Structures are given as C-alpha cells and as structure tokens.
Amino acid sequence: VDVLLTVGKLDASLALLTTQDHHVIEFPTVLLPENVKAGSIIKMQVSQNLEEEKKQRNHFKSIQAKILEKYGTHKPESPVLKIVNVTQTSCVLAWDPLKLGSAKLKSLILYRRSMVIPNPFKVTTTKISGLVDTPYEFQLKLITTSGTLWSEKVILRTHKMTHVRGFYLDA
Amino acid sequence: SSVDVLLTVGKLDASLALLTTQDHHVIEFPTVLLPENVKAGSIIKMQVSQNLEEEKKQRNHFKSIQAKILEKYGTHKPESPVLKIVNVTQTSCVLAWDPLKLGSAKLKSLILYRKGIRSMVIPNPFKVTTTKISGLSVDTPYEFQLKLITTSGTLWSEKVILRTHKMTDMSGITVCLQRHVAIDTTHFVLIRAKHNNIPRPWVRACEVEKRIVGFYLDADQSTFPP
Amino acid sequence: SQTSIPEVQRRARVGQFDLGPDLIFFYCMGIDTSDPTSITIFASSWNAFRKYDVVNMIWAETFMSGIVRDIMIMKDNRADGESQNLVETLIFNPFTLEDVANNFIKLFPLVYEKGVYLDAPTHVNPSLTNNYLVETLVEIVRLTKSLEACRKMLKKLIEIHPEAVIILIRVYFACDLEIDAVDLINEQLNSPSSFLSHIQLIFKSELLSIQSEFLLDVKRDYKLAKEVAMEAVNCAPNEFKTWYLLTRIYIKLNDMSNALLSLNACPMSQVKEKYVLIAPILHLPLPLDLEQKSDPNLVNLSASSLKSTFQLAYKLLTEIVQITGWEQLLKYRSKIFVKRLCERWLDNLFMLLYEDLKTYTDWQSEKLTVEWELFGLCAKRLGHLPEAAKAFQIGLSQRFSPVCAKNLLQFYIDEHKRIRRDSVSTSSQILSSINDIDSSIIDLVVKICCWNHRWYIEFIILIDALSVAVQDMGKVHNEIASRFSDPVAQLIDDNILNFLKNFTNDT
Amino acid sequence: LSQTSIPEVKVIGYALHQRRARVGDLGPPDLIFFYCMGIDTSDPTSITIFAKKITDLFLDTPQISISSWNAFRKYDVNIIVVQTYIINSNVNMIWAETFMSGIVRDIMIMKDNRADGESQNLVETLIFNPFTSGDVANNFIKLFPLVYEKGVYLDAPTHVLNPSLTNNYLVETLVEIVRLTKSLEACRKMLKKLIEIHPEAVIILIRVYFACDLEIDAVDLINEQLNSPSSFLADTSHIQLIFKSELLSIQSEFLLDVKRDYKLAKEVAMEAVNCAPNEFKTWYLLTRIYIKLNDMSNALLSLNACPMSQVKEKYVLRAPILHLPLPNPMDVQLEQKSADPNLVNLSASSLKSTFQLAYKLLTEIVQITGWEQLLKYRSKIFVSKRLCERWLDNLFMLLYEDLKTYTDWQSEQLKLTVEWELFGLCAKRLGHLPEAAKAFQIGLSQRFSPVCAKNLLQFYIDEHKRIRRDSTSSQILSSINDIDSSIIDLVVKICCWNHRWYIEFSIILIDALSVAVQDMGITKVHNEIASRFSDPVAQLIDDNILNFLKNFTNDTF
Amino acid sequence: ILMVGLDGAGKTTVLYKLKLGEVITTIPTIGFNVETVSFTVWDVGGLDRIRSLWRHYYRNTGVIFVVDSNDRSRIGEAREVMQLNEDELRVFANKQDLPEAMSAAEITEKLGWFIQATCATSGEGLYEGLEWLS
Amino acid sequence: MRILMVGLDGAGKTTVLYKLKPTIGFNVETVQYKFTVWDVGGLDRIRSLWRHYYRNTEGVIFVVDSNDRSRIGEAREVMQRMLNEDELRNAAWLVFANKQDLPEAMSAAEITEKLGLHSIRPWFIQATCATSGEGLYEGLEWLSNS
Ligand SMILES: Nc1nc2c(ncn2[C@@H]2O[C@H](COP(=O)(O)OP(=O)(O)NP(=O)(O)O)[C@@H](O)[C@H]2O)c(=O)[nH]1
Ligand SMILES: Nc1nc2c(ncn2[C@@H]2O[C@H](COP(=O)(O)OP(=O)(O)NP(=O)(O)O)[C@@H](O)[C@H]2O)c(=O)[nH]1
Ligand SMILES: [Mg+2]
Ligand SMILES: [Mg+2]
16 A cells, blocks of 8 residues: 655654645654655555564464463472471471472461471471370461462371480489 | 665554554554555554655646746736727716726726716726716816726826817717617607607707707607708 | 723733733723833833833834734734723724834834744744734734835845745735735745745745635635645645635535545644733723623523634534535535544534524524524524624614624625625616615714723724725715714714824825 | 541531532542441441441430442432432442442542552541441452443543453452452352353453462463463454453563563563553553663653553542541641751652653663763653653653752751651652661651651561562561561551541551561461550451451451 | 705705895805895705715705706706605705706606796796795 | 469460469469469460569569470570569569479479579579479479568
C-alpha cells in the first residue's frame, strides 16, 4: 500500500502530513529524509513483513518456554525426616537435604508447636532438649512460596534406664 | 536516500492504529493506509521516500492556477463611461450611454450628475442604457455627466452640455417616424396595453402654424397635402 | 452632560494582564491619549506592547493600543451585535485638533513589529500580518476611506519590511481596488523578486487564504477558489481558517462528501477567547436625549451561546443540512464516519443540530417577546432568514428588544445587498423596494442608537447600516428629523452622521 | 466499643435531606448524622442486629436510620428503625449488591490510600473491621459471581486507564480479601465454576494463586493461556487483546518484583506494550526493567512515552460544614507553626495518580547517574530527538527542588518534629531510606506524629524482608527479634492512635503485625504486647488485629 | 394653508402671483416660504431632501397641491406622495399654458376636494380656486 | 512471705510446687513450713509475663534442669537479666538444681560455675529432686533465714 503525502508543518521533532483524502498525520521527523523541508511531497510505501513476524513469533515462544522451564514444572518435594539417635531424655532428629524446584522456602517448622529451624540448609540436624520410656511423635512442615507440604510423621519411644559425677576428671 | 523503518502494530480499531517502534515511538496511523492482512501485533515495513517528480508537478500546477487567476481577475482595468444624447425637447431630454464595459470590475453604482449629485441613480445600468430627464425649463442650457462607481476604483468623465429647444423648434418631436414606442417617444399618433401617459394626425397643425400646438379623440373636430 | 456617566487607584492587580479599559471609578473608552495636553482638555491608559500603566514613544504606544481596544471591542463582538457585559463603561466614538484616523496611520509604523504582542483574534497562529494591530488598521482605513493616507504610509514600510505588502493588499480590497490588489498578490506568489524559509511559510498561507477567500466571497468562481484553498491547507494544516475556507468551497460545489471530511479535519480553538472588557461588585443615570418571565426546552438550547470556531463550524453544518436534509445527512455521516473517526466536537454539533431542527419544527407546526427572540435566533442559525425576520418583527411589536432590533436591521441589510445584485442579472419595482428598505433601516438605526445612548454607548454595526442608506439617498438627515424629534436627530447626527459627513475623507 | 469512639454532628432531618439531592464511583460512606463503614449489610435482619447493638448503647448516660449505597445500580437503600425504601438516581439481589459494594468501599478506602498510610480526611467517620462483622470473608466469595459481569461499573483504580472484567475495584477487592483471609480453597472453588461460563475469569484465578503462595500453579496457568490453543484468547479483537495484555503484564511483573530475571522480564514487558500501548502499567513495567538493566537511555524514552492519568482520582470519603468523644501521650496542638518556606512548598510532595509513580522512577534514575549526568542524557534525547511530554519536564523541576533540599540538609547536619517529617518524606522520595528513617526516628522522640510512626514501621518491615532475603546464627536471632519488637511497639502505638480517631481497621497494621506472627507464635505476640503495654491496650490490639489473625485466616497459623 | 407638491410645479410662482401680483424669477426652494394673502399660505420645497420636512407643517393646516401638468413622466410620483392618510390632515393643475399639458379632467383620473386648471405665469384660474377654498 | 518461682520450661517447677503442697499461665499455692509461691510458665510465650510478678517479690526460686546440658546457656541469659531488674533488687535468690536423680545431671558446683552465681544480694544453690522430694525443704530453710 503506497500513498503520496504532503508535508505541512515541519518542526525538529514532529511533522504534519496531509493526504488528498484529507488525512492529517503527526509523524516523527527522524523517520523522514534529510532534505524534506516543508511543503514537499513524500512517497510512503507501507508493506507487511512476514519473515519478521515469524522471527518474533518464534522468539516469543522461546521466551514463554524459557519462563515455564525456569519457573514452574519443577515442584518442591517431600520434607522427609529421619532418626539419628535416641537416649533417655533426648533424641537427635535429622532430615535429608531439602529439595526445592523453585524459590522460596518461607519457613520450616517441626510438629509434635515446636520452634522454627533457623538454618534449614546449613544445619539439617536438630536435637530435642527436654523429654523416660515415653512415646513421642515428630513431623516436619515445609512452607514454601510454591505451597505448604507436611508429611512423614515419625513416632518413637524413649529408651529405658536399662557445647556420671563420680566419674569426672576432678572427682 | 530511502528511509526503511520496521514498525509494530499496537492497538488497532476500525479507524486508527497505533504503530510502535524499537526506539519507543507511538504513531497514530489511519487503518485505511494499511495492508489488508494487518490484524494486530503484526510487523510492517514503511518505506518513506521523497517524490521529486511530484513536487515539480505541483509546482507547475500552482504557477498555472495563479496565472489563470491573474488573467481573469486583475488584468483588465475598466472603463470610462461614454455619455451621449438621444433626443432633446422643449421641456425634456433623453440621455444614454454606451454599453458599460467591465471585464471584472465589478460595478457598484452608476450615478448621473447635473451640477452635483442632485440627479437620480441609475437602477439598471446594463438592462436599460437610456434615461429621460423630466423637469426642465424652456430654452435653458444644462450639463450632465455620469459617475461610474466601481470596486476597482471610480472613473467618471465626458461631461455633455445641452440646450432645450425653443417653442419654434420642433426638431425633437418624435411620434408613432418610429413604429415602436421607446423612451424618447413624445407623442402617439382595438385595445392594447399601450402607454402609461403618452399624449390623431395635430402633425399637420404644427406644420402650418410653424410651432408646436386638444387633438384628442374625445375633443371637438376641425387637411393633409398629398 | 452629567448623565450618560455611570458611577460606583485601588487595583494595581497587574501582573495578570491580551489588550487589557481606561479607568477614570467608572471605565471609559475612546479617549485621545496621543498627547498629555489633549488629555487635560478632556478632564489611565494601558498598552499591551509594553506592559506598563500610565517620552513621545510612551504616549504613542498607549494611544495605538487604546484605539485597538476601542475598535476590537466592537469587531470581536460583532456576532453578538456588539453586546456589552460591563455596565459601568462609557464608550465614545474613537473616530470623532487632529483626526484620530490620520493620527493612527502616521503613528502606525512606530508601533509596528510589536503588533504580535497584541496576539490575534480567536479564530486565528499570530504573526506580523495577522494580529489585533493590523486588524484595527484595516478596519479604521475601511471605515474612514483614507486610502491615499494609508497607501503612502505602507509604501514606505515595504522598503524596510517587505512582508508588510500583505497589509497593503487588504487595504486595497477594502478601499475598492481589487485589480491593484490581485496584481499585487500575484506579484508575491509568482515574481522572483518577491520577498517569499521558515518565517515566510506562514506568510504564503495567509496570501493563499486571502486570495482564496477573495475568490469565494466575491466573483463566485468556486473552481479556482478550491485549488488555492487546498494549497492554503498544505501550507498551514493546523490553521482553522484554511480548513474553514475549504469546507465552504465543498458546500458551494455541492460536494457534501468532502465537506464533512474537511469539516472533521478542521482544528478547533480550545484556549483563546474573544476580547471583552477590576473590582467585583450602583448608580445608573438614565440620559434624556423588563424580562422576569418564563418554554424550558426553548431557553435550554445548547446550540445557543456557542463561542469561537465551534460557532462558525455549526453554521456550515446547518448550511449542509439545508441542502441535503437530516435524513440524507445521516446517510453521508454513517458513510464516512464510524472509515475515519469523528472528532467528537463535530458529533456534539449533530446533537445540537437535532435540537434546533426539533425546536424549529415544533414551533412552525404549532407568545412572549423573549420567546420570539429565542425562536428567531434558532431560525437564523438554521438559515431560515425570512422566517426568523418575522419572529423578530412580531416580538418587536409587543415590546422593544435590542436582540430583535439588531437582527431585524441585519435582515434589511442582507435584503438590500440581495436586490442590488439581482437587479444586475421592472425599474419601478427596484426603486420602490430599495426605498422601503432604506426607510426601515434608518428607523431601526435611530432606535438602537438611542438604546445605546441610554447604556452609555456612543459608538460599527450601526455606522455601516446607516452608511447603506447614505450611498443610496443623499436627505438622510431630514429623513431622521422628520419621523423623530429634533434632539433625537441631533443625537444620531453626533454619533453616526457627523462621522459620515466629514471623517470619511469626502466619500 | 462503648459509647465513646462515636462522633456526632448536630435541625432534625438535615442528614438525609442533603443526601437526597446529592444522588445525581464507589459512592459516599454509609450515613447514620455520623458516617460509618464495615457494617454487615448482607441481610436486613443482620442490620437490625447492628442497630440493636446501637440502640443498646442508647441506655446509660451519654456525656454530651442508616443508608447504604451501591454503585452497580445507582440507588440508595435507606432503612429506618421498620421503614425500608429506595432512592433512585429480585429482593435478595438488592441486599446482595449493596453488601458487595459496601465491602468494596471498606477495602478500597484503605488500599487506594496505602501510599499515604491510609490517611483519613473525614473525621466524623467510624470505621469497623469488615472481616469481623460476620462470615463476611466467606460471604463475599459465595456472592461474588452473582455480582460479577457488572464489576466494570465500579470503574478501576487511578493507575488503570482501561478498565475491564478483570481490572476493576470489584476484583481488586476480591484478591485483597482472599489474600488477607488466606481463603484459597474457598475462592478457587468459586472461580473454577465461574470459568465454565466466563473463561476469561481465569486471569483472576491466577492473581489469587500468586497472592495465596502458589507461584508454580500460577505460571503454569499463565503459560496455558498464552500458548495453548484451547485458551480463551484463541477463539473480538479489542476485548480479547486487553486480556492478553493483562496476562503479559502479570507475567512480566512477576518476573520483575520477584525472581530478579530482568532479561526475560523485558521481553514480556515489550509484548505487553504491543498489546496495549495506551495503557500506563505496560509502559510503567518496561521503564522499571530498563532501570534495573542499568539502561538509562531507553529508561527515559519509555518513561516519556508512558501515558498519564489526567481525569480519574483515588477513592476518598467525601453536607459541608463537632462532637469528639475521647476514648498514652495523645495531647496538645501539632503544627500550627512556622516552617522553612522552601521545605513545606515542595511541589514533589502531594503528587497524585501516575505522576507519583513516575516520579519514583525518576528519583531511581538520578540515584545512579546523578543530576549532572542526568542532564547529559536529557539533552541527548530531548529538545534525531523527541519532544518532552511537559509532565516529565515538570518532574525534573520537582526533582531539582528535592535534591537541593536534601543536600542542603545533609551538609548542614554534617528541628521541629514536623520539619523532620518533611525532610524524612523528602529523603524517602529520593530513595534514601536509612537517612529518612533517622529523621522519622528523631521526630518520633520529641513527639508522636502518625507520619513518623507509619513510615518508621515500614522501615522495619523492609529491614526484616532484607535480612530474610540476603540470608551467622547469633546475628539472625538477635537482629530479627529486635526488629519484631520494634514492629510490635509501633503497631500498638498507631492502632491506639487510630482508635482515638474512630478507626478500628487498618490493612497496613494487619500486614505489619502479621510479620511478627509468622516469626513468633500467635500467643507470644499477645504476651509481648501485654508486657510492654497495659492490659486494656493489649485487649484493644487483640480485638482489632489479633482476633483476625487468630481465627479469620482459615487456620494459617 | 399648506401648499406643497413636486419640484418645479410652480408653487413659489403661484404664491407670489397672489401676494405681489407679479411674476418673479423663481429658484429651487431650499427651505420654505410663508406669505399672507386672510390666507396664510405655507409654501414648502418640493425636493426629496425637503419633502420629508412636510410633516412639520401638517398640524393646524386647507391643502393646495400644485401639479405640473406638462410633465407626463412624474404624474405617478405626484400620486404616491399625495396618497391623505395623515391624521393631522384629516389641487392646482399648473402650467396649463404649455401645449403638452394635461387637462383638468385627465389629472383628476390619475389622482383618483376640487381641482382647478391654473397658470401661474398668466395668473389664470388662481382666484377661481381661492373662491372654493373660502 | 511472697515467693516467685521461675525458670525454663520442663525444669520441674510445678512438680516442686505441688510436692510441697506444660503450664500455659501460672500456678500459685501456699506451702506451710515449720510461703506463698508463685509458679509461672517457663515457655517462651509466657516467659515475657514474668515482669508482672517481679514487684513485691521477697524471694526468687530459680529451678534449673540439671540433666539438660544444652539449655544451660539459655538458663544463664534469663537469670542474668533478672538480676538487673530493679523490682528484684532486694529479693533473695534460691537456685534449685532439679532432676538430680538422673545420671547425666550436673552437680550443684558445676551449675554454679555455668550460671555465674559467684559474680553476685544473698544467694544459695541446692541440689534437688522434685520426684523424691530431696533437698526441697532444705532450700526453704535457707529461704526463711533471708
Ligand atoms: N410655462 C409656465 N411655467 C411656469 C408656470 N408656473 C411656474 N412655472 C415655472 O416653473 C418653474 C419652477 O417654479 P417654482 O415656483 O420654483 O416651482 P416650485 O414648485 O417652487 N419648485 P421648488 O418647490 O422645488 O423650489 C419656474 O421656472 C417657473 O417659471 C406656469 O403656469 N407656466
Ligand atoms: N527425673 C525427674 N523428673 C522430674 C523431676 N521433677 C520434675 N520432673 C519431670 O519433669 C517434667 C516437667 O515437669 P514440670 O513440673 O511440668 O516442669 P515445668 O517447669 O513446670 N514445665 P512448665 O513450667 O513449662 O509447665 C515432668 O515429666 C516431671 O515428671 C525430678 O526431680 N526428676
Ligand atoms: Mg419653491
Ligand atoms: Mg509449670
């Protein structure tokens, strides 16, 4: 589609283009030739560029697929916790390295109400301080931005009697 | 020196369209000036080139029109009015003027002058080129001149003097030799529309008495030589 | 004399001042401020060229600016019959030891080149040619017919200001010199020795606008007027007058298709306003020389009180519907609009057009004097002149009305011009028809002038109106002194007739 | 909640008579003479219950007809205690619409004013907690689809130029309610049923997922709409195009606000522009990306082509003309004094609409380049150049005034509390948060002031998020605890100040106190307040904010 | 008595023929002439400029309308000016000596009271008209 | 005599109190010997509410879990900030080393070093066992000779 235009007013920034069908178009000067001046006749030939459309179409799909791959498709997994060692008045609980598909972990809470783990990624072990021959249960609560996932409840019985004063080095 | 720009079609309505470029330009553009399969979000190539062949064409056209306007209006400068005399009687006179020539003047008003603007103003200077002066004195000199008022200027000239005829002078008497009744008709010698106030062959009486002299078809009756 | 002087410094409120009236507590216009000694004879003028409130240059600028205010206050309000909103103002005739008209000319080049500071009329991109200073000059020269005085001055101005030749062209057209003007126009647009790269482009458009308007208003010839109007648009597509002319051409060329297109691309005035006349608020001495009434849909006509270019555009819209009709107009409308988008303001005018057509039809199919005014103005807007003249004449019988009188007066002026043109293309019929109009004009001019004197107005519409009769009949003075009283005839003599008798350079 | 904290204004019948002729946005607050918000107008019987609580207040000795409005259909519902009538500009639908419109007003009055710290201009208003006027939270969800499709009549926020079925005050209220109450399964169930008849409502479901901590589920859903042929986008050309732009805007903003990733965020932002170049948010996003990408050249170009809001305004409470029943300091006259003429006349302050948001980006640009280097960029691309959009040029004038003020202050420092506010707000506008917090903290010592308290509170919130994002053990335990205590200390003070001016609801304070609750237990927070403050004060915070978190959050804790 | 009529009718000639009994050289009257002949005759100019000033003399007025019989062209103009509708006023066929002058009977038809054929130069039928006026 | 008995959670405060006669709140009982003891919860949630009872306190019984080695550092911080309280300026200080029956329990001399009681009003530490009742009345005897 080619149409002949007449240059009305011409400023350093914009321009007024007038057609024979009484169209008035404000047009940026930088897209006009250098020797346009004012009161000149310009030939504007507008054509569709299909190959450039196909380039952007492929580019857009590439970006959308890239976003889906990075964020999404990969979900956070199970907060599995195990038993290291149990005494009579204390026990040491641990959990496999937390695997999170996408950021981020909001909070890691133990359930038996218990406190929140300060460094879940650096320290994967927690020792219950106060507790003889009494059944207890534990389970982890993984609160992430992707969702909250709690599983693997573990029950245990504390051992019986069957960072010792008389066996001290100063006794 | 053609400038090639790649633009993206933003919003698109039935009338206008918003074109976006990589340098963040938002151009309001008529949809009718766009291809048929434009849709929305499509990439178009706009080639803006100067048309030198069209510039000289409009230049030649502009100078042609201006020259034609000059030739019709603003070239012919008209025109002194020529005042003439048709016929003079004892108590009246008929004045006339040559067809007023005005190429593109245009005429505003034509005023008769007899020692001032005391006389009347011509109603139809083009349709009627003759006027008759009614009230005059016997054997008395007069002078007349026409004032042509035109929107290209006022041009008046050619003042004419005349003296009304005496009672013994019958050279101004015209009857019905004229077959048709005109303005300078003085006398009229089966009903017709006829005259408004124009006064029997009386003509023989004026020849015998050697002066202008009752001769109605209603009055009393009282010989034409062959 | 004591009366015709309203009464009611203390408002240095400057900083916020266009043209700017002279405060004397009452305001006054038409005072000769060219010389301080001449002012003392009369006993605070303001100039917009240099914003200061009142050596020779000082009295010069304040005089010129004063005269501009005195003239433009009557010319910008010509559409509303020179209506006066401010009551406490006393307006004298600016034209009536030295003739002000001749003084304005000799003092013109000294104040030239600063006329841009006076801005431009509301329908105008101001310049050295298009401004209130030049508009005032061409108006003074036209009224006083001082051709040889203005012509001599302008010719000296061209030597140093070649662009001032445009002013001389406008003077020639006003002082009956078409051929000399067109010869001068073509000289600027064709001859290589003309002054006609950025400053000149706005000058070229003005020349094309003048030439195209000249081709349109007179000499008919719409074909050649079209080719120039389009060239005027290509020079200034942001100007109103350029598109306004082209639209008028299309209407006369019976092309309503492009008439609507050109009207749509026609830019409107959204900021500038018409020139009108210190302390928000009386003594009203009536010189010797009321409404309070109710049709709700008749007074609420939005088509009334339209200002700026919106009014002029509406006049063309009514001119189009006069030929096509409302049904055919909508067919054209729906054909070229939603295609291209309508500029909203045009769409609003269609709504206003419907209201006037509804009102006009409901009236004719089917009253207080005010109701006759409102309907009369409605019929005038739609282009029904003889139907509007009847309404104004009927409303003028039950009571006196300035709106009715001024509009009925304008009717006889248009009717007078019509007959004189039709007579060219019986004799007794013409002589009688013209005479009847002249008498009716004089009868109306006296009444309006007497009404103006009552509201402290001693000064263009009435002068031109009575001037029509003067060109026809010599006799005018005795015509007034006959039908009216002696002191009334003396009033008309001072206000209007004295100007025509002497201050018109023996026209 | 007893007789006090109820303002009044005195000829009988002056109230409704001025309301009757002013019928010709969301509308005015519920007039009772005093105004009131947060009333459960879902049922006329529930209204009589509210009136019952009011008429049970008429007893005892005071120490000297409600009318709700809906914007969906412009008519006023008046109920006198029982006469019930309608004032113009199926029975269940009437009470349904007026309730929804009521809740929208109660929420948007606190959300549109979030920038100004939920400032209240109208004194005679009594604001209740809309969530505790039940269940209102669950009732809004079940009653949402019945009022849907008419949400466009509520228009949109001032930053939204082109409203739709997705971008409007109704949806903005919904996503805010669901976020605060954490009613995911309730809203998700409702929206899924709405998609069946309105497939374009999936955009709303995406926003809910983002708000209710479901990023992956949201992005997976976004990709489904922008790629899969079975999407509603692939089926007009303008109604569908604005839906695509919103999806691109959400996706791009998600990439920007979180997940860093400015590169991928840019590619989506530009596509959002190509879908809606007349929209503000599209250009606003792209400008933010450019700033984050350290590309100040195109940042100024994108900021210039950014459309502004020139008509629409933020929602505020509006017969023009008092009884003030007083319910620790709270004393004497503030301001009414002299101040630095160039400090109070700062035009950069009181910026409204998009002009405020644009100024924030401008200060973010000058922070990196500097004023001298900014003029080099400015003179390079402004008057192969383009014309400045005037409003942008004006912001440069405003920027120069703030930089001068801030520099003249810091050079001097190297003052009245109100003067500390003005400088603090000035430093905050330029992006100098820690220097502004000091100004607010200094002004907080000599006097209370709501501006200083609200701004210093937001500082600790930002400081809290910063540590959690950047993250020894001992440093974390001490830094967080000190912040949490300072947060609680400020929340209590502001809430007590709001209660004095008849305000029982503040979204800012609810979100603020929620920060500590996530860290320390719901019961620990209460005892923290009851320790440092008195018992009735702790009870006040318990009723206004803590009761909401304890129960009306669907067992989030 | 108010004596009016078109210009050149012979009004001044008639007036001073009854007053002085002598035919004086008359000129176009720019104003008016009043003489007592006891008939107080008011002679006003017949030009278009002065013709408008006739209204001033209509009050307390017999009316003598002098008509130029010889001038055929302006017999229509003489009719319109006379065509009597004035509330304040609720014919001399002059120049009968000239050949082309209309008869008294013809003018009566054109005008459509008493008409008298007069001749101011000779004085014929002047006193005849005055007798009827008494 | 008014006594405030505090300490960490699981120390055995309630056990000690009702031997002479998780706590979400407090328990107050009057015990006769030859003492109005105020027992407040030791949980982190209730630990802040201890200041309300600091006033008019004549004696303070700090129960310490001898068996629990891990929270002896936590037990130190809580005690050191109580000694700086103006309300507990003249109040006596009685430290109970509870759960002394358990094998891994620290000796009274060892706990005294960890708590830093030698840096101090009159104070005394006593090895106690709430389950058996050993050394409970012994502590009350010193608490009466304040
Ligand atoms: N032949 C002839 N001429 C006459 C007669 N009466 C008047 N005239 C002429 O008519 C001319 C006009 O005379 P005048 O009395 O001035 O007429 P008027 O009506 O007074 N004119 P105006 O009023 O306009 O001054 C004179 O030249 C006079 O001689 C008459 O009976 N016969
Ligand atoms: N072996 C042993 N266990 C004891 C002794 N005293 C208390 N316990 C045990 O310690 C546990 C905690 O008892 P409790 O009195 O509730 O401790 P507390 O300090 O009151 N806890 P809290 O104050 O937080 O409620 C109980 O299981 C109890 O049997 C003791 O002397 N020896
Ligand atoms: Mg005479
Ligand atoms: Mg206990």
